[PDB]
């Protein structure tokens, strides 16, 4: 039943005042994009930054298994849009937040289905 829980350890580290993971790769872009969460090319709007997806993935960055039957990564090879106000910690934002399955915006930061 044992398994390393990287997601919780990072949340715990942040909660106790640890410095967020750095060197997430921020892209140059127009900031006039759709603002959707995870995209094939940078889609940041005026309120967001776009990052190379692999560099913002806890599992890729920590060199550990991705948590799901086949070790698939949601972020690598893609671009992730992070609200500017959270762009100091892209890894934590992607860990803690969910993409709307319908409009592809972040739940709570763009998705307006509810």
């Amino acid at each position: 039943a044992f398994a390393v829980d990287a997601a919780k350890a990072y949340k715990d580290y942040l909660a106790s005042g640890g410095q967020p993971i750095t060197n997430c790769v921020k892209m140059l872009c127009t900031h006039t994009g759709t603002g959707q969460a995870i995209t094939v090319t940078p889609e940041a709007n005026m309120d967001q930054e776009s990052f190379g997806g692999a560099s913002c993935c806890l599992y890729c960055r920590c060199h550990i298994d991705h948590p799901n039957p086949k070790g698939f990564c949601d972020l690598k090879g893609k671009y992730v849009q992070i609200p500017t106000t959270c762009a100091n910690d892209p890894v934590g934002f992607t860990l803690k937040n969910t993409v709307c399955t319908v409009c592809g915006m972040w739940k709570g930061y763009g998705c307006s289905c509810d």
Binding site: C24, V25, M27, C29, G52, A54, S55, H63, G77
Partner: protein, 298 residues
């Protein structure tokens, strides 16, 4: 003048035609840094300006384009330049990257090891190299042509670059190779391009535009590197981030360039003219298969 609004500066044709002796490179602004946009890494800015300049050339851009990127890792353990290449290239382009040291990447496939260990079954439409040996810093002797990964790159281009394909290979004052300049004469056109964000370095990308697979021009690489250094020594380039601010026309144009199989026998003047204009790629269009040689010992 308007230079500071360009992504960088290409070596002017008249400098390529000189016969200079090699001298020490002494840049007016050596050591100075550009002011980058907030939170942007130097390597993101540098690759963005390289791709901006490549947008001005007649690159062949087939469907299912294939790009390989050497020297893609950083001391940060991520691949900023690969992230830029993936942003620039058409969606669906197969991008393979590689470096001596482990790193995390957005490429479709990554090989870790000395470049000399890398083999590929297929040919490539674009080869990018940012390889640079830290030890090039330990300058004792006269600055002579370097071997190491440049020997590999020269062979890799001649064996694995599709006709019509292009390359951009990073050099500096001391990290350079005479045979690589010689091989620039096997392309329809070539230059040495300096990014505006890194204008205070002797770094340049040696760009070979549309590979012809045979010499169009006989270049002496010792002389050409001396010519490059003379140009750098006599033409200060103002550091500039200006071009990073306008990304509206950044993505490489999807030209849908034709890909054909042709044997040795069938490359005539007609074909050479299409290759020369960025209108044709010649290579097989089979699966992309790569590997890295592993030495086993104990």
């Amino acid at each position: 003048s308007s230079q500071a609004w360009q992504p960088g500066v290409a070596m002017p044709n008249l400098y390529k035609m000189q016969r200079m002796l090699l001298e020490k490179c002494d840049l007016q602004n050596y050591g100075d840094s550009a002011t980058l946009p907030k939170g942007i890494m130097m390597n993101v800015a540098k690759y963005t300006q390289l791709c901006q300049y490549l947008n001005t050339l007649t690159l062949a851009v087939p469907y299912n384009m294939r790009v390989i990127h050497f020297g893609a890792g950083s001391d940060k353990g991520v691949a900023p330049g690969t992230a830029v290449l993936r942003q620039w290239l058409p969606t669906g382009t197969l991008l393979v990257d590689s470096d001596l040291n482990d790193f995390v990447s957005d490429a479709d496939s990554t090989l870790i090891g000395d470049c000399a260990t890398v083999h590929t079954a297929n040919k490539w439409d674009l080869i990018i190299s940012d390889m640079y040996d830290p030890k090039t810093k330990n300058v004792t002797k006269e600055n002579d042509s370097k071997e190491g990964f440049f020997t590999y790159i020269c062979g890799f281009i001649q064996q694995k670059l599709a006709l019509g394909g292009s390359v951009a290979i990073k050099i500096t004052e001391h990290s350079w190779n005479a045979d690589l300049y010689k091989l620039m004469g096997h392309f329809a056109w070539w230059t040495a391009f300096v990014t505006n964000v890194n204008a205070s370095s002797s770094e340049a990308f040696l760009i070979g535009c549309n590979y012809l697979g045979k010499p169009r021009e006989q270049i002496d690489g010792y002389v050409m590197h001396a010519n490059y250094i003379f140009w750098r020594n006599t033409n200060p380039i103002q550091l500039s981030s200006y071009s990073l601010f306008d990304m509206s026309k950044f993505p490489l144009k999807l030209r849908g360039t034709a890909v054909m199989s042709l044997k040795e026998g069938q490359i005539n003047d007609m074909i050479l003219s299409l290759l020369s204009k960025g209108r044709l790629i010649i290579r097989e269009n089979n699966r992309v298969v790569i590997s890295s040689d592993v030495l086993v010992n104990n």
